[PDB]
Design a protein around this ligand. Structure first.
Ligand SMILES: NS(=O)(=O)c1cc(-c2ccccc2)cc(-c2ccccc2)c1
Ligand SMILES: NS(=O)(=O)c1cc(-c2ccccc2)cc(-c2ccccc2)c1
Ligand SMILES: [Zn+2]
Ligand SMILES: [Zn+2]
Lengths: 261, 260
């Protein structure tokens, strides 16, 4: 058991989850001193991202985030191996401090962050197995700011009412997951890091897109106010807010960028 | 023991030092969504900070920072209790990333930070006794940025080449400590937090001055490259760099400001 607040919060994760105290931890602050342009970072292609509206995908409150289960026929192409999707989920702040992305840029948080988790399906049968292995996982990170209403994000947010409490789940119809990606996906930061939640395994190839997507203030408030970290019958209900880890030390790492600036 | 890098680094402190995973942890990011003006925050007076040039004070490389021992007649006036000085020390980054202040302001690190540690001498016999007790400690924090050469800071820095390894010590002729402070000490942030190193006791009244001081890039580079965490005889030396703790969550609480 672990949380983002109080005694079982992030400084205590390493007690039961020793990788959380190890090297190569995520997230990090992206700032000029540790960035280096790498022209070998070519564009990714997203395959199988247009999920059938006639199929259903499980949306779940796992007590730490809201997560949508994704099929293994969604793939990234462009890394050394092909990686297939397993799930996506979000991180956010709170109505009075609406700045809860995990990665920061030049010390500034965005409003929220989406993570789309993939695993090396060339080598491993599933994400559980891959999660233990070197470069077993690849995660795409989309930084979220306040802006215009985003119809594609509402294909998640409009369903939060059904998964208010920990352990609640609802099937939702497929939609085009590519619509959650920002413009100019060719522009990104790349580094070797970790899961940002326990067990914090240092097995993740990170791709953080340079350009944020926009969602409306009403959308963001819905995300920040709809969910609880606790079971429906828990006697000490806790809102699901500020579910992001603080940035970690660099540990001599550089972040490579597919752009110069 | 404890370190700032590897398996004994800050995410592992709580395993041996459980207050590192408890309440009221420092340092924090000083931003507007958590600030609040409060009129009771009047100018601190710095008494006995003009150290006698006829005394000498011990500079030690403790393996985690460089620290100068201070005399207990040096004290802060203006708080509910009297706080008496025990030591000062610094925190910094590294040549590749020279931004290693502990506190940040609107997400921004400064180059380095100075901490002048005092103990509540009204309540407690010594710093040792005070550190884990109620209202035991008050720390002054000065944020350091690059700029003009600073002779005041050189009174310390000039000795760096003599304390390069863990457990090495050197003597420093008394000088005026108030020269290490910025101008306009009247403007400062104030909050209850913790030691930023193990055992992370939540017993510190922080004052972080609004205004930074300046040191030259030659001075900053000396600080970042002069010292080791390890003993001289060590097969695998470790440079003393990035000796700052990451900022902590600070939720539903308030930093009070003496200014607006
Ligand atoms: N924040 S993340 O991108 O590093 C991440 C990845 C995976 C993950 C999932 C499947 C296989 C492998 C890794 C799970 C989570 C997670 C979020 C909330 C609660 C528990 C776990 C978070
Ligand atoms: N960074 S700090 O201000 O919160 C701090 C205060 C004190 C401290 C010292 C004496 C009495 C009471 C508190 C000691 C250190 C320290 C730095 C390096 C190694 C070990 C300890 C750090
Ligand atoms: Zn995540
Ligand atoms: Zn300190």
């Amino acid at each position: 058991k672990w949380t983002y607040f109080g005694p079982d919060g992030e400084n205590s994760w390493s007690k039961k989850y020793p990788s959380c105290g190890g090297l190569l931890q995520s997230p990090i602050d992206l700032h000029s001193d540790i960035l280096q342009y790498d022209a070998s970072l070519t564009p990714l292609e997203f395959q199988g991202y247009n999920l059938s509206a006639n199929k259903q995908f499980l949306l779940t409150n796992n007590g730490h985030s809201v997560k949508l289960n994704l099929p293994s026929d969604m793939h990234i192409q462009g890394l050394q191996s092909r990686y297939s999707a397993t799930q996506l989920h979000l991180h956010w702040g709170n109505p009075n401090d609406p700045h809860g992305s995990e990665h920061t840029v030049s010390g500034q948080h965005f409003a929220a962050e989406l993570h789309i988790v993939h695993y090396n399906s060339d080598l491993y049968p599933d994400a559980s197995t891959a999660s233990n292995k070197s470069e077993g996982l690849a995660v795409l990170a989309v930084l979220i700011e306040m802006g215009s209403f985003n119809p594609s994000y509402d294909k998640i947010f409009s369903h939060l009412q059904h998964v208010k409490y920990k352990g609640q789940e609802a099937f939702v119809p497929g939609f085009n997951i590519e619509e959650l990606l920002p413009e100019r996906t060719a522009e990104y930061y790349r580094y070797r890091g970790s899961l940002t939640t326990p067990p914090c395994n240092p097995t993740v190839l990170w791709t953080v897109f340079r350009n944020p997507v926009q969602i409306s203030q009403e959308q963001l408030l819905a995300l920040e106010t709809a969910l609880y970290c606790t079971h429906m019958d828990d006697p000490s209900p806790r809102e699901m807010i500020n579910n992001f880890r603080q940035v970690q030390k660099f540990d001599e790492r550089l972040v490579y960028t597919s752009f110069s600036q």
